[PDB]
Amino acid sequence: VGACVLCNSQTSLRCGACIRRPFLCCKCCYDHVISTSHKLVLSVNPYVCNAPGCDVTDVTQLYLGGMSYYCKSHKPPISFPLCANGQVFGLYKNTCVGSDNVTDFNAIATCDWTNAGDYILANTCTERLKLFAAETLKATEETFKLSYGIATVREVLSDRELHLSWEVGKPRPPLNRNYVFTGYRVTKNSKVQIGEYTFEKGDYGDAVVYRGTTTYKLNVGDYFVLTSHTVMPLSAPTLVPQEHYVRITGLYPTLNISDEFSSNVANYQKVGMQKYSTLQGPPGTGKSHFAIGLALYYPSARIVYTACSHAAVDALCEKALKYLPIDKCSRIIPACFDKFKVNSTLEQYVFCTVNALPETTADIVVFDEISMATNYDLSVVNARLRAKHYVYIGDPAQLPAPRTLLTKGTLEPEYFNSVCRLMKTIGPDMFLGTCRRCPAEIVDTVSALVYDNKLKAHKDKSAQCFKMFYKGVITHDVSSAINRPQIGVVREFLTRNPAWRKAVFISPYNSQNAVASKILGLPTQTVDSSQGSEYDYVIFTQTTETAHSCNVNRFNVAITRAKVGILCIMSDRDLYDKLQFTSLEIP
Amino acid sequence: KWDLLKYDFTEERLKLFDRYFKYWDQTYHPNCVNCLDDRCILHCANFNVLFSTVFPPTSFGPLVRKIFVDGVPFVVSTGYHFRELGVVHNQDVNLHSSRLSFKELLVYAADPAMHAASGNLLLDKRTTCFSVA
Amino acid sequence: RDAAMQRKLEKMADQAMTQMYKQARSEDKRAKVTSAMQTMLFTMLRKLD
């Protein structure tokens, strides 16, 4: 019973033919009604042929016959044409100013969410339209995922490899990154849960690696149910207008400019000079260092950090223990990291994932890894904070949020959401070119890649990265990556220098990494499971020449994790024939 | 001194009856629930209105118990214990419920279990009627 | 007949708008009551355990 999501006039109708039952002013409702077969309409009641037996729904053919909307079979003498006059008959039957930007709305009122233009528009409409677009989007993606397998756990092997079986004809789970199931432990008569656990692919056979939060254990019979949820209506905009102040309005600069903070201190002034700060970040290049430097920079404000999951907040809480003393910090866990006080926004510093963050209001929160951010969550934040400052961290050039229904076609990182969209309009306000991680080997060349050399050759020349010319004997059986000759070439290319016996194996699919750790003896890491993480000698196999392996940004954020040295066995040629590591052969 | 918790009281009732009105000539069945066509309810509601001036006037009235609205402790009146009609127990009772609708919401806000279970004890010296809360 | 039935259509439209407003207000106050009810209930509750 509120403003029509298309005309802002206040009304009381709901297109029960869309999934989100919005409000449509009589005019705009009329438009969308005709515009497809969005034919049911929900005001106070079901607009149906409530005429018994009859049930025909569309309004046009519906007929107010006395106190009940009728068809023709039952329609009384005096009756009434509801859908007519170009204006539906509904409450406030006058004050429906109507609108024209409805076509877009209608296609959105119906889209698949699959190809580009879908998301092109989803991220390019107006505010309220994109609000509701995203709402519907998540409705689609979720209800898509409901009829799949329950993981009845047996062979609880090792501390990683629950092995798992299933309910036979029902499981359809992929395994890398994080795929959350909630474990139910078989208890007397009902079912009590165990925690959320995400699972990897995992080396060797059915030994499926797992991971989640919750300090519980697992039991034989602990059946995991594929998680289920219901999206919630947003409200506050994705992005509230920016205002660059005439002061550090509310904040008080700093009495000490720490070296690790000083280069970022340069920024730490003008951040109080505007409501919120937009930043491009070279991967991990003192990102958490930037934030903590601003924290000790403004030691007065309730400074909140939020990211995707506890995994981007991993290094964050690390940097907290680094320089944010355990006093003025709160660490929060849902039902992972709670090193500080569980649940206290009443805190100088408050560390969280957007999901574990409820509504709040303070001064500054960091809003990070925006290459994985959505205007959905870009609203969820404003729909949870009114703090004096936000700050916007990440180059859209890094990765996507895993658009799992973005099928045919891709997306421009800008379109990953309106910040990313505007971050490709306005670029950075501030920046972390300080490659506090990689030597010049990676930095110079991978800056020539797409940053366009904007990464100063940071430290020195390690060079111990090997672009080894591979051809590509890569396999994927059912959904598991395996590549026996690249398995064995990353193997032997380690062998003719044995002492490298230290590195974790990294793969686009930790199934390729799985069977590698099944032939290597080396640990596992996704190319995805990357930021924060970084080993001295890190190996990666270009494996399958897919976009999930060979782009700029995927192995870009997985390429600045090279603190000293990388190996890469390239079935792929461009970055071989473009990027300038040490060129190496093929045992 | 009947211990404060004993609400049941039956074999007492029946024992008094068998020591005094033994040679009576139609069965007696304390809890009137077990009675048949009302007239047996009269012929046992008397004997209760008598045997009930011997038991103590605290263990008369509702019988509360603690439940859980989605993991949240409540106290609700699951029965009753009149002065005649013996003991009477609810029949559709249900612990551990998540979200409760309008109906039961209502029927909970009008039970004195919740009200007096959380109030200052009282003692009045102006009446004789046994105060409570 | 035009200037006949049309009167009926109009008056009946209007009475429909009336009753519909009424239904709406009814349900809305139902929402308010449910709210106040549960909140009194819980403010009573957390003083006893």
Ligand SMILES: [Zn+2]
């Ligand atoms: Zn619709």
Ligand SMILES: [Zn+2]
């Ligand atoms: Zn409208």
Ligand SMILES: [Zn+2]
């Ligand atoms: Zn009909």
Ligand SMILES: [Zn+2]
């Ligand atoms: Zn009887």
